[PDB]
Ligand binder design. Structure first.
Ligand code: 2HA
Ligand code: 2HA
Lengths: 318, 318
């Protein structure tokens, strides 16, 4: 099944593999599972994110100039602890403050917010944005509202650019609020992640949370029909509207299948006469070895957002 | 070293052993590590506490009529998760509301407070009290302020009685605030807990947190001199004052040694001409197999507190 060593070492061994390979990030003093960018501090707002391990490249792979300052990596499918996050906050600060980018899950939000409080007692200026883009099915388990998924990666990029453009904590906070409201995602799974039949489930969570509907095998086009259909209901498509699109694989789905799926999406959208100005395909927020994918659309209600999506970055995975 | 089975099963196997032995408590639907009293609900304020496992009998042993409604047991030395606690809140409520008794540690407080919020969204009335009785040494690791230790057990008993006497959530909240401020504790360790030399450490934490001073072996009387000395500085002893006393063993310290220590404490206190109206010795909040003990004093600034300490209860460990 897995290429690993001792199951309780996977996070540390991975991060050591990561830093060995890409000296361009660093692991904070070999006592913390935090990956920080080597890019010299220069009074930019610092962006900090993270969550459970098992979603690679999510977070650590988006640490670099133009995106995240640091990523705090928890245990597999488990939020980082507030001390880890607190350490990342105070180590990432450049003098302009820190924005927390938090995926909407009970644990992640609890932890990051506590870390925030800790960091504020040390007089660090910190704001937060909670990403709740998953429109699958409301209050999954104990997630309060919508789960935060692949769309988070776009939030990193868009805010990443703004921070790199010397915007203030306040401005970036205001932008995050507008941006997150215009990002919607829905995914599906052909299989569940394995943590160290002929059926599919719509709306599966990235931690292998249950979805809203189980179905016997459907074709790519049929699956695409379901997902675009849901996103169409959410955004209420009108001709002339501008969107970006991200097709994101869950880990064990070949690129071939993601592009076949992209093709189907394209077909389903031509009817809508909307303008797709940004397209992206690949494994950006996975779920270990889950077979499946998700479809993310961002309504481009501001020319700056596209410019930011296309802004220069130097990360491992972008 | 240990009598256990699979290290990851210790909490569940223990709780199953507990319920088998003492049907008088129950484990909530075999999906939660919550121990609730079988005592029939009757519109009393419900008391809920908990924390990491490894401090037995702490919490589960004090679940019964006259004390706690339920205890939420986490992994070893680890706070329970907010969902577990949330489930205990809504299952313990009798219609009069729920008071959370939380030991002051970063994790416990984070978790219980989140659980509180969850429970309040379901319109459950909940108050909280954070116990910070450990005067050892301030902001240990990330504990914000003083750690919550053995004195918590007294808080259970005193509030336990009040709730049993049909006091309202508000009144009980007000009492907790006054009570916790008058409870102070300091302990020491001859050895650290082992989780599944000739030196002692003063102010060791119940999770094997570091203390304030390490010392080569001292006699019982010398150790007692240190502890009473610290508590004397805290309370500022004056003749005529009334106190209760709890000598609490850490798990691997024989009762013989706890009584020899009690004897030394008595001697050191006779000079103070204070009135000791309540005395108690034994293993009430342990730390696995730690050799050591702690000394807890409660200033009895209200005749009701003593009456409550002596009030009837039906728990496993009191
Ligand atoms: O891995 C999950 C998302 O971070 C934990 O909630
Ligand atoms: O076991 C410890 C006290 O509950 C965890 O903080």
């Amino acid at each position: 099944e897995k290429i690993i060593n001792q199951p309780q070492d996977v996070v540390s061994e991975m991060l050591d593999g990561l830093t060995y390979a890409y000296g361009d990030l660093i692991e904070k003093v070999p006592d913390f599972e935090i990956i920080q960018r080597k890019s010299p501090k220069s009074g930019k707002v610092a962006l900090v994110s993270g969550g459970g391990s098992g979603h690679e490249p999510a977070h650590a792979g988006f640490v670099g100039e133009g995106m995240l300052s640091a990523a705090v990596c928890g245990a597999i499918f488990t939020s980082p602890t507030p001390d880890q996050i607190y350490e990342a906050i105070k180590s990432a600060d450049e003098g302009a403050g820190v924005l927390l980018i938090i995926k909407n899950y009970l644990g992640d939000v609890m932890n990051f917010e506590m870390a925030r409080e800790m960091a504020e007692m040390e007089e660090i200026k910190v704001e937060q944005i909670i990403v709740d883009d998953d429109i699958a099915v409301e209050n999954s388990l104990y997630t309060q509202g919508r789960r935060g998924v692949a769309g988070t990666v776009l939030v990193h990029k868009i805010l990443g650019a703004a921070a790199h453009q010397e915007a203030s904590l306040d401005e970036i906070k205001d932008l995050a609020d507008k941006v997150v409201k215009n990002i919607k995602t829905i995914g599906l799974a052909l299989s569940a992640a394995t943590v160290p039949d002929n059926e599919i489930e719509y709306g599966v969570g990235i931690h292998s949370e249950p979805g809203y509907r189980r179905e016997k095998m459907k074709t790519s086009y049929e699956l695409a029909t379901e997902l675009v259909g849901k996103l169409k209901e959410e955004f209420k498509f009108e001709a002339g509207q501008k969107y970006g699109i991200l097709v994101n694989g869950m880990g064990a789905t070949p690129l071939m299948e993601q592009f076949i799926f992209m093709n189907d999406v394209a077909k389903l959208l031509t009817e809508e006469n909307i303008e797709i100005l940004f397209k992206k395909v690949g494994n950006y927020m996975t779920s270990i070895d889950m077979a499946g994918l998700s479809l993310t659309m961002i309504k481009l209600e501001d020319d700056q957002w596209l410019k930011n999506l296309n802004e220069d970055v130097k990360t491992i995975s972008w």
